[PDB]
Design a protein around this ligand. Structure first.
Ligand SMILES: Nc1ncnc2c1ncn2[C@@H]1O[C@H](COP(=O)(O)OP(=O)(O)O)[C@@H](O)[C@H]1O
Ligand SMILES: [Zn+2]
Lengths: 348, 626
């Protein structure tokens, strides 16, 4: 029976429980370890339609209408497609999104929601817990190792120590295992944001780490009577009634949302030659014009192969979100749409 | 019982000892060595145990011997003495036999087939012969152990000689003399006994974790710290700690592979193929392919090391982490480190004394663990100043000297360093001098052999060239050959610089010297890279072509042609009037030389060598019918 047990195994073991005080032990005798049903629900989801937006609308209806931001959460939850090219060279299948914004907007609730939705999500605030929260200790792995093949949500990312951020960069680059999708939330370095300054000036993080992100949405708590009137009515109804004021919409339950994501995870879309030329055409078109954006010094970052590969991962996610066997142009345009939408927050 | 039969096994080995050959390769192996062993004044033989798998019946013995190694070796000891006696006096070839006959011998098989690894062994595999490999770390001092006990009778001074059998001390009860018979009169004298050396050597074992080895007699102090080791001994765990009673220690492909190597060695696109095949994910970058590759080839080591080191000063969006992460895998196993996540202790070591061993012990850091190999240091611009101070002695003597409280010693960390460093700020700024774009002091920046300035330009044409390469690669030479090539090149080729190649270095270095930061550090690169190019060429001497190409590589890596000699700034673009005049003057002279010779025309190959000591200029003349 030896070598039938290994550490970390959730097992059912039958044995003889054996021993004026007597210490006790057990001699093992037997060792064991621990779809049309869901397809009908998928058929109902297909019957309802609007799968791309229904899932995004279903993500935390108690949170204000950041639909384009929550769409990034849907693709991050789905994730991209890994590509072991060969010779040991690797391309990550994960999606990294940052959530910058002023305090008091309760943005951490979305971090709770996404971590709750994901079956392998790990939540973390500020610096690592007692230091051992990152890397491993004499080994007991940290949060990043715990979220392997999962999602890590971080609140107040900028306050992390250099050692804390050093381990972050390796995982963000090598995924070791610590295969994770990183969702970060951070308050402005000055307490309150200044749009007149560059995002790097208003945050502790440098460009070396931000360039590793896919989508870098910024939240500006701009005082506006028009927008705040809807948000206040939205929130005050959430407290009054156990559902969002948009009762016309029926959200998808988290188990079904999780199941479809798992169903999506099985698929593998592949690029066609038609979209292949479209991707390089859009990349060249966007990269050349993005030179003016960086020259204006009023944009988050210059167009680099981060944009080309970022769209590829997002297009793969969108195609895999649609359960498509191959990637189509509309996924690329939608991916390009969301990327361009993220820049709009800087111009409020 | 015992699988070993006393007479059967000695007869089986006797047939092997007189009839073995490998398949001039036809000569018998030990028919020659038997005379050499009788010549030797040695006391033991390191048996070529790979012969056991090279012969049929010997492998059958190995499986039988897997559980009874001691008995055969003890028989072989007497066999060796009998073989010596028979060859000396029975064959009448020698007469010096007295010391050999009285003394004792041993035999040590050194290349037995390896077992299923350490952690895969089983409780019944204990006491079985095994073969393992690993790295030695620490050594205990000489520990003597009892072999003979000396007893003197405390009332009559009679002396007895008592020897230990199977680790048992037997105290005599009475004096053995007829008259003196007092009970318990025998007493032990500590310093009249006989002892044998026992040493514990610590090995970092990699199965086919660290295991504390054990050695005895002449095997002690033969293994010292840092030795590369293969183990032929006995796995042991006794009432339970895991340890190996080392019987012998080793202090350290097909001809079809040679044919495969020569094909790549002969083909003209060798350098082009290597760049095309080393990194499929990275597009083009011919010089960067040549750069890191020359780091892996390395220069020659003489006593002066060939540890080529490279700094990637590229823009912070060019795939360079995609390289060094890949380099850590393809290269012979090294260490992947980040300057941000490393410290002086993390790179070098932590050294402390030991109560038991009474000599210094080392906890090897990242840098030392890469001894003799290749290491990658990402985030080199973010390394701490104290840690950066270590590299000065590392990149000048490959040693590290420590003198602190209670510890004064020097180490060795011979290794190659691959460094990548982002420019100061969010992007490279060519409006500033290059030495101001790099956050490294001149003393440290000068000692690197190669610095590469990889810049990304926003060009629509070049974007499509890169984009279509990657976009179709993720639809739907091998690493085994590449590692086989590099290991072959490092194994054999030790090129020597020729006289012609030597003299050209003087003009090459002086030319950079008069344009001044051309310290003598860059002159090290003018030989280190030269040897590594010949090693790739597999030419056993360094050619002048290797010299000039390496100089060009240094020029191209630093981009001297695109750098302002006044302020060190870089040209963004890197039809002109100087191009016009050179073409005009060239065309004027071609029209004369083509007709000055006593012919209406001549071969263009000879014409080029006549004036260069051109095709466009003559094509234009052909368009004008001249
Ligand atoms: N020439 C190139 N070939 C392949 N991939 C590239 C190239 N340039 C940029 N990339 C991509 O851009 C991303 C940036 O990674 P890299 O430049 O290696 O490190 P960093 O993110 O620190 O700049 C990588 O995922 C890489 O795949
Ligand atoms: Zn006596």
């Amino acid at each position: 029976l030896v070598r039938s047990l290994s550490p970390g195994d959730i097992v059912d073991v039958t044995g003889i429980f054996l021993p004026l005080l007597t210490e006790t032990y057990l001699e093992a005798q037997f060792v064991r370890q621990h779809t049309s049903d869901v397809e009908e629900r998928v058929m109902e989801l297909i019957t309802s339609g609007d799968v791309y937006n229904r899932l995004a609308k279903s993500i935390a209806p108690e949170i204000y209408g950041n639909l384009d931001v929550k769409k990034a959460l849907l693709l991050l939850l789905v994730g991209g497609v890994d590509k072991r090219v060969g010779d040991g060279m690797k391309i990550r299948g994960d999606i990294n999104v940052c959530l910058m914004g002023d305090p008091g907007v309760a943005k951490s609730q979305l971090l709770k929601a996404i971590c709750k939705i994901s079956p392998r999500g790990v939540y973390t605030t500020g610096k690592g817990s007692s230091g051992v929260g990152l890397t491993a200790a004499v080994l007991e792995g940290g949060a990043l190792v715990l979220a392997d093949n999962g999602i890590c949500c971080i609140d107040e990312f900028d306050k992390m120590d250099e050692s804390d951020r050093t381990a972050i960069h390796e995982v963000m680059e090598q995924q070791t295992n610590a295969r994770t999708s990183i969702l970060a939330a951070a308050n402005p370095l000055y307490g309150r944001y200044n749009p007149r300054l560059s995002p790097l000036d208003n945050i502790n993080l440098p460009a070396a780490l931000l360039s590793r992100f896919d989508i870098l949405f910024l939240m500006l708590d701009i005082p506006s009577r028009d927008d705040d009137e809807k948000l206040a009515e939205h929130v005050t109804y959430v407290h009054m009634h156990n559902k969002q004021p948009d009762l016309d919409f029926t959200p998808v339950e988290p188990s079904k949302m999780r199941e479809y994501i798992a169903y999506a995870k099985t698929k593998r879309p592949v690029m066609s030659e038609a979209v292949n030329d479209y991707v390089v055409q859009a990349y060249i078109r966007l990269r050349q014009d993005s030179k003016r954006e960086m020259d204006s010094k009023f944009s988050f970052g210059q167009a680099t192969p981060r944009t080309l590969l970022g769209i590829i991962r997002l297009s793969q996610a969108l195609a895999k979100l649609r359960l498509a066997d191959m990637v189509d142009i509309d996924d690329v345009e939608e991916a390009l749409r969301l990327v361009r939408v993220s820049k709009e927050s800087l111009y409020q | 019982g015992t699988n070993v039969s006393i007479q059967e096994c000695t007869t089986n080995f006797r047939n092997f000892l007189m009839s073995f050959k490998y398949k001039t390769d036809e000569e018998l192996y030990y028919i020659k060595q038997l005379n050499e062993m009788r010549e030797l004044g040695t006391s033991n033989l390191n048996l070529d145990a790979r012969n056991l798998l090279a012969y049929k019946q010997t492998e059958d013995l190995y499986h039988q011997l897997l559980n009874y190694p001691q008995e055969v070796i003890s028989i072989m000891d007497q066999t060796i003495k009998d073989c010596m006696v028979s060859l000396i006096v029975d064959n009448n070839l020698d007469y010096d036999l007295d010391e050999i006959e009285t003394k004792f011998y041993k035999v040590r098989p050194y290349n037995v087939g390896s077992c299923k690894g350490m952690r895969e062994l089983n409780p019944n595999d204990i006491d079985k012969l095994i073969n393992l490999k690993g790295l030695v770390l620490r050594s205990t001092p000489v520990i003597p152990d009892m072999k003979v006990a000396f007893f003197k009778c405390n009332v009559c001074d009679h002396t007895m000689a008592v020897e230990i059998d199977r680790g048992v001390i037997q105290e005599p009860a009475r004096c053995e003399r007829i008259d003196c018979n007092e009970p318990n009169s025998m007493s032990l004298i500590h310093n009249r006994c006989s002892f044998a050396d026992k040493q514990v050597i610590k090995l970092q074992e990699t199965p086919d974790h660290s295991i504390s080895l054990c050695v005895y007699d002449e095997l002690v102090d033969s293994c010292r710290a840092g030795d590369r080791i293969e183990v032929t001994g006995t796995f042991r765990s006794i009432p339970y700690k895991t340890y190996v009673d080392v019987v012998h220690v080793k202090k350290v492909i097909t001809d079809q592979d040679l044919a495969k190597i020569r094909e790549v060695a002969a083909r003209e696109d060798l350098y082009s193929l290597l760049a095309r095949s080393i990194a499929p994910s990275i597009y083009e970058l011919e010089d960067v392919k040549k750069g890191i590759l020359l780091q892996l080839f390395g220069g020659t080591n003489k006593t002066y090391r060939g540890d080529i080191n490279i700094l990637l000063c590229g823009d912070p969006s060019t795939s360079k982490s995609q390289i060094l992460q890949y380099v850590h895998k393809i290269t012979p196993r090294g260490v992947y480190t980040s300057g941000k996540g490393s410290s002086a202790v993390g790179l070098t070591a932590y050294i402390t004394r030991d109560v038991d061993t009474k000599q210094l012990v080392l906890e090897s850091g990242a840098l030392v663990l890469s001894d003799g190999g290749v290491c990658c240091i990402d985030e080199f611009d973010k390394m701490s100043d104290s840690t950066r101070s270590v590299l000065h002695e590392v990149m000048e003597q490959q040693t590290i000297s420590i003198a602190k409280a209670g510890i004064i010693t020097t180490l060795n960390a011979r290794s190659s360093i691959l460094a990548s460093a982002n420019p100061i700020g969010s992007r490279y700024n060519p409006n500033l001098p290059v030495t101001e774009n790099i956050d490294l002091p001149p003393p440290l920046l000068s000692r690197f052999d190669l610095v590469y300035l990889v810049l990304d330009k926003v060009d629509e044409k070049n974007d499509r060239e890169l984009a279509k390469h990657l976009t179709n690669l993720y639809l739907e030479l091998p690493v085994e050959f590449l590692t086989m090539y590099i290991s072959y090149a490092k194994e054999h080729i030790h090129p020597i610089i020729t006289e012609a190649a030597k003299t050209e270095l003087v003009r090459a270095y002086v030319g950079m010297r008069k344009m001044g930061t051309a310290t003598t550090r860059q002159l090290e690169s003018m030989i280190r890279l030269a040897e590594a190019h010949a090693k790739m060429k597999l030419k056993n001497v360094v050619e002048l072509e290797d010299v000039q190409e390496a100089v060009r590589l240094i020029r191209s890596a630093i981009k001297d042609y695109a750098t302002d000699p006044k302020t060190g700034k870089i040209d963004m673009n890197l039809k002109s009037v100087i191009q016009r005049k050179l073409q005009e003057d060239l065309s004027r002279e071609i029209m004369n030389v083509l007709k000055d010779q006593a012919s209406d025309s001549m071969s263009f190959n000879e014409l080029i060598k006549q004036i260069n000591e051109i095709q466009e200029a003559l094509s234009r003349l052909q368009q004008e019918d001249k």
